[PDB]
Design a protein around this ligand. Structure first.
Ligand SMILES: *[C@@H]1O[C@H](CO)[C@@H](O[C@@H]2O[C@H](CO)[C@@H](O[C@@H]3O[C@H](CO)[C@@H](O)[C@H](O)[C@@H]3O)[C@H](O)[C@H]2NC(C)=O)[C@H](O)[C@H]1NC(C)=O
Ligand SMILES: *[C@@H]1O[C@H](CO)[C@@H](O[C@@H]2O[C@H](CO)[C@@H](O)[C@H](O)[C@H]2NC(C)=O)[C@H](O)[C@H]1NC(C)=O
Ligand SMILES: *[C@@H]1O[C@H](CO)[C@@H](O)[C@H](O)[C@H]1NC(C)=O
Ligand SMILES: *[C@@H]1O[C@H](CO)[C@@H](O)[C@H](O)[C@H]1NC(C)=O
Ligand SMILES: *[C@@H]1O[C@H](CO)[C@@H](O)[C@H](O)[C@H]1NC(C)=O
Ligand SMILES: *[C@@H]1O[C@H](CO)[C@@H](O)[C@H](O)[C@H]1NC(C)=O
Ligand SMILES: *[C@@H]1O[C@H](CO)[C@@H](O)[C@H](O)[C@H]1NC(C)=O
Ligand SMILES: *[C@@H]1O[C@H](CO)[C@@H](O)[C@H](O)[C@H]1NC(C)=O
Lengths: 828, 49, 49, 49, 97, 49, 48
């Protein structure tokens, strides 16, 4: 059985397969993609009841009636109940029963009266509700009364106390699991409208992941502002006035009798059978210290609308208001001189100081400004005020201003703060010249991994600043170092018309008035893609004979087995590159391969690569195709092979004549080489401080570079939902609702929006290319200086004395396997 | 299901349990389920570029 | 087709290259609708002038 | 001139000014924050290095 | 200074909302209408922010050329005598600090 | 002399010191006015030292 | 050519305002509303 023990804290154990847990929705379930959403996935109980013990047996949302919960239990009010079945006769027979605050409800379905489904209700009546889908296998009820089948909300019952079954299994094999659920909000990896896996937005790091829509997180200095308190005390400050009050009270009574009584301060009261209408304010909310110059009430128009079952509406009347802007009328929560001034210091507090409303922390300040009464920044935010009764100056600092975190190896190691106390569970806080820095490290470390412009952070989170005979080494060891350099970006092209107007012909014929708008966009994209293709195409040289010098036999005791491009085409990808391409998790947001042969043949619903193609976001085929890259790299390897260990010995000879070409030392250096090669292929395949950390860095940088493209693409393809202040987000829906004269006046908003979206996306592209160009030039320089040659500088080609380097293909980039010699085992 | 649009409609061999309307990130419909027969009709736009 | 393109370029010369385009959908289209079952109680509204 | 001074912005604090309901509404603008602050962080990194 | 002032002052404009303060909106109206108010502010803020990004990226790419030039000019005219007129000043170069 | 002759611009400070920001002892200077909008001027790369 | 044309054509769009021309919009409305009308034109022209 795929039934599990829920862990303490209500978490699904992370390897569960969800083999029937549909993602619930009220509409339009998604096919593929990472989504962030609220779902009922925090479980107070799950128990598994088998057909041996199918019985009638209600469950209340307070948890009573539960079976033996598996693994964990809690007695909070659950909001939802989820039934996962495994017996195919399902809800076809037997019935579901429900208790409601004013009666009993029962759900049943019958074909012979396909199974059309009906309800019986007693305060007795019956209703047709819908039809049973082909196989219900999971179904769910909300305490608020929404009823869900296979993820879709079919109807409402209103509030419900308890749910019960008149159901029995078909065979002793069968069982169903019943679970009480409440809402979490979660990040879900949806595939084939299946769940694949989720993460809860519980911890801080999970807050980051839950709001980058990314399961991986790069290293770097991500900012956050910590969540505020769910509740606030209230503070109010006012100028003293001559106090007087008026009640406005609206009375409703009806049968399927609205009255105003008597139809410097005032207040409003309102007293399965009110709307703001067109007024720029809401009844009741008028109390929240809105102002008027004057107000008049008459039986803008606020219709009073009775509802039945949220299913019928009846405008039992209308209240009309006229108002002047100005002052002297304000809402007051309660009905002859002297202002109240309930003010709380230090607590983050909602305020209405001098009819400026906001949230913040009020504090006494030592400042003494004779001018003014309220002080404001350029942004218009309130900064501080003067108590006219005393001259006391107060400051209005917002709670929880942003911090910056330090993330490394997908953990938080340190946090810059603007306050002297610890937080987030960190241990110690040190003051640096412009900020505090909390962490859990202890300052014994001596080598950083992240560079805050002028500081380093090491693996513990300890911040560090950075800037007679002799014990000559007896031996020099070899080591391997990895550089990744981005070399290309895969060009994208947009068909401006089909993106903007979605193919609706009237919209296309309207777009022509936006003279050359689409031209100057798509033309910038095309020109970038040309230049990209030319500049990479020229850089990839070749030479057939030089390549053919490369074979694994042609290297003696140095086992380059994994580097030599595989036998196919001239060649296939070599083993290391194969490892990388299988290692990198492809993005869930934007597929950057393409295949358009299938996008209309229609045998299956369109995958992302076609889905974004229907909007015209045509990912072009990559300019540095695998075979061509393998051919180039092979030509480089055969270049440096151009006796194979004898050139190596010549270099060792140069760097140290008498030691490094002794035959015993030569053999030792072959051993060291084979060892280092093996250690790096180990680190790339799975589970050193100046060796494997390079591998970690390269894998981080590659995953990052993929991710940032996927997100640029997802921005553009996600703005198509945005309705830019028009009646509705679909052009076809607008033209159904409106005559052409008003239709164009609406659709012009969608057009002027989407063209802004493109004129941003083109900027993302062109800046990305200009960042890539410097990298490509640098990589070319490194090819010339440090594979076809021997380096004359330390560091520029690895931290070490240069011997030789190696080049391999990688996602949009090159990996340089530098190797260097280091002193070892010194003797005086 | 009160989503209005233009498209070629084609029966498709892919099958799912969940939901009724299948939609992309852009909010375009990609395919809808027939409640009574369980066939899934894919939706494909006319004249893609 | 090439003139149809020029009319989008607003130019009489069109430099060599790859340009994106979309063919034109037909002028008449079948209506098609699908809905959930519901109980029917149709009403007219008729305005006379 | 040798260097600008790197600047960083925080989306949610700027846009919503710390109103919790506004931030709950900003989730609907998918990736709308990410692509800004990333384009600032990466450039600041390059300037530092 | 101009770039930062522009950015931090767009924040004051109301972008056709009822008011430029979000707390004012949620105070005055009922959430279902206040939301389709506030989405104007949100879109306007995002627009201004995305302009300021382009100010930053242009300023970086313009300074990169100047920096690389300066590093060239120092690599010449302080670490060596210059070998041309004009490049390091009108006259015959001796040294530069 | 140069550092004295060039005058900073009241349109926006270009180096800030955050550690006193949340203490409230005074009304904020322009650096913390910015910082309350999430604009976070980072320390310059090339320190005077 | 196309760059500059795309610039100059943005003036014709009304940006949801009552009119694409400032004189007309300020004639036909009272100042406390014509002003927040012409706000729309200002914002559009700046984005262009
Ligand atoms: C489908 O639509 C309905 C409403 O249109 C959604 O139901 C609503 O769900 C939210 C949270 O999921 C409920 O809010 C909660 O209300 C209780 C009230 O005591 C409060 O304690 C909670 O903190 C939370 O605020 C809301 O009441 C509920 N009903 C309505 C009428 O809004 C349903 O979630 C939607 N389903 C999907 C998949 O979107
Ligand atoms: C999201 O889920 C899908 C599966 O539904 C993952 O895709 C598979 O991932 C495994 C690794 O766990 C690969 O070995 C398979 O080749 C993938 N197959 C398919 C069809 O995608 C996907 O990797 C998940 N996303 C993340 C970030 O883990
Ligand atoms: C749930 O509520 C009902 C009535 O309020 C009560 O009889 C029942 O005992 C409650 N269950 C629990 C576990 O308290
Ligand atoms: C209750 O449902 C049964 C079938 O489940 C049906 O025969 C009966 O008519 C319903 N009750 C009423 C009052 O319609
Ligand atoms: C820091 O250390 C303390 C005690 O050692 C621990 O409670 C806390 O969880 C740690 N936090 C991190 C992020 O390491
Ligand atoms: C600042 O923090 C350190 C430790 O983090 C503490 O020892 C010191 O007293 C604090 N100073 C002030 C003024 O709060
Ligand atoms: C190199 O290592 C591989 C690892 O499997 C091994 O099979 C091979 O025999 C070794 N030698 C050569 C020359 O490839
Ligand atoms: C694309 O079409 C070919 C046609 O033979 C098919 O083999 C391939 O699987 C299709 N791709 C997808 C993703 O269905």
């Amino acid at each position: 059985e795929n039934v599990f023990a829920v862990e303490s804290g209500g978490y699904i154990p992370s390897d569960f397969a969800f083999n029937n847990w549909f993602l619930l929705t009220n509409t339009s379930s998604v096919v593929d993609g990472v989504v962030r959403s609220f779902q009922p996935l925090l479980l107070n109980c799950l128990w598994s009841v088998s057909g041996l013990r199918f019985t009638t047996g209600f469950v209340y949302f307070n948890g009573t009636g539960r079976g033996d919960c598996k693994g964990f239990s809690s007695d909070v009010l659950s909001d939802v109940i989820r039934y996962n079945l495994n017996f195919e006769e399902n809800l076809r027979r037997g019935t579901i029963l429900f208790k409601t605050s004013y009666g009993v409800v029962v759900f049943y379905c019958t074909n012979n009266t396909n199974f059309y489904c009906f309800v019986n209700t007693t305060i007795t009546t019956s209703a047709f509700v819908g039809a049973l889908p082909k196989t219900v296998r999971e179904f769910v009820i909300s305490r608020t009364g929404h009823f869900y089948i296979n993820g879709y909300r079919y109807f409402t019952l209103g509030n419900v106390e308890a749910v019960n079954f008149n159901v029995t299994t078909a065979e002793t094999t069968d069982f169903f699991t019943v679970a009480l659920a409440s809402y979490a909000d979660v990040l879900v990896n949806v595939s084939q409208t299946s769940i694949a896996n989720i993460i809860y937005c519980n911890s801080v790091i999970n807050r980051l992941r839950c709001d980058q829509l990314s399961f991986y997180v790069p290293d770097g200095f991500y900012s956050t502002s910590p969540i505020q308190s769910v509740e606030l005390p209230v503070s109010i400050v006012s100028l003293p006035v001559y106090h007087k009050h008026m009640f406005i009270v609206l009375y409703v009574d009806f049968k399927p009798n609205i009255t105003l009584a008597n139809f410097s301060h005032f207040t409003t009261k309102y007293v399965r059978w009110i709307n703001t209408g067109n007024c720029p304010f809401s009844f009741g909310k008028v109390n929240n210290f809105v102002k008027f110059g004057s107000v008049c009430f008459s039986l803008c128009a606020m219709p009073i609308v009775a509802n039945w079952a949220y299913s019928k509406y009846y405008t039992i009347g209308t209240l009309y208001v006229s108002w002047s802007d100005g002052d002297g009328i304000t809402g007051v929560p309660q009905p002859g001189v002297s202002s109240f001034m309930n003010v709380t210091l230090d607590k983050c507090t909602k305020y209405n100081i001098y009819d400026v409303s906001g949230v913040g922390v009020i504090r006494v300040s030592n400042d003494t400004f004779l001018n003014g009464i309220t002080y404001t920044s350029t942004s218009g935010n309130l900064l501080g005020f003067k108590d006219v009764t005393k001259g006391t100056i107060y400051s209005i600092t917002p709670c929880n201003p942003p911090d910056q975190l330090v993330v490394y190896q997908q953990a938080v190691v340190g946090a810059m703060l603007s306050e002297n106390f610890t937080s987030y569970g960190f241990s110690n806080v040190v003051e640096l010249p412009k900020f505090f820095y909390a962490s859990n490290g202890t300052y014994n470390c001596t080598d950083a991994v992240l560079t805050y412009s002028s500081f380093g952070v090491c693996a513990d989170g300890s911040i560090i600043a950075v800037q007679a005979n002799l014990s000559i080494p007896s031996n020099w060891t070899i080591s391997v170092q990895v550089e990744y350099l981005q070399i290309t970006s895969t060009p994208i092209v947009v068909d401006c018309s089909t993106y903007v107007c979605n193919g609706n012909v009237r919209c296309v014929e309207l777009l022509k008035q936006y003279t050359s708008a689409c031209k100057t966009i798509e033309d910038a994209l095309r020109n970038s893609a040309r230049l990209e293709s030319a500049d990479v195409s020229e850089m990839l040289t070749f030479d057939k004979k030089a390549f053919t010098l490369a074979n694994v036999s042609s290297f003696g005791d140095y086992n380059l087995s994994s580097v030599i491009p595989s036998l196919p085409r001239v060649a296939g990808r070599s083993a290391i590159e194969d490892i990388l391409f299988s290692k990198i998790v492809t993005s869930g947001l934007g597929t950057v391969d393409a295949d358009y042969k299938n996008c209309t043949k229609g045998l299956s619903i369109a995958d992302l690569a076609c889905a974004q193609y229907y909007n015209g976001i045509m990912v072009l085929p990559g300019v540095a195709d695998a075979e061509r890259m393998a051919m180039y790299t092979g030509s480089l390897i055969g270049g440096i092979a151009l006796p194979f260990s004898l050139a190596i010995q010549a270099r060792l000879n140069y760097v140290a004549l008498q030691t490094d070409v002794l035959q015993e030392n030569q053999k030792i250096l072959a051993a060291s080489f084979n060892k280092a090669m093996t250690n790096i292929v180990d680190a790339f395949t799975g589970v050193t401080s100046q060796a494997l950390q390079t591998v970690a860095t390269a894998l981080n940088k590659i995953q990052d570079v993929v991710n940032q493209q996927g997100n640029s693409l997802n921005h553009l393809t996600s703005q198509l939902r945005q309705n830019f202040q028009a009646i509705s987000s679909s052009i076809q829906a607008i033209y159904d609702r409106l005559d052409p004269p008003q239709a164009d006046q609406q659709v012009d908003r969608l057009i002027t929006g989407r063209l802004a979206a493109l004129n941003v996306f083109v900027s993302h592209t062109l800046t990305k290319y200009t960042e890539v160009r410097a990298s490509r030039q640098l990589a070319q320089q490194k090819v010339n200086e440090c594979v076809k040659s021997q380096s004359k500088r330390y560091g520029f080609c690895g931290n070490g004395t240069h011997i030789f380097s190696i080049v391999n293909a990688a996602p949009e980039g090159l990996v340089f396997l530098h190797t260097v010699l280091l002193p070892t085992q010194y003797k005086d």
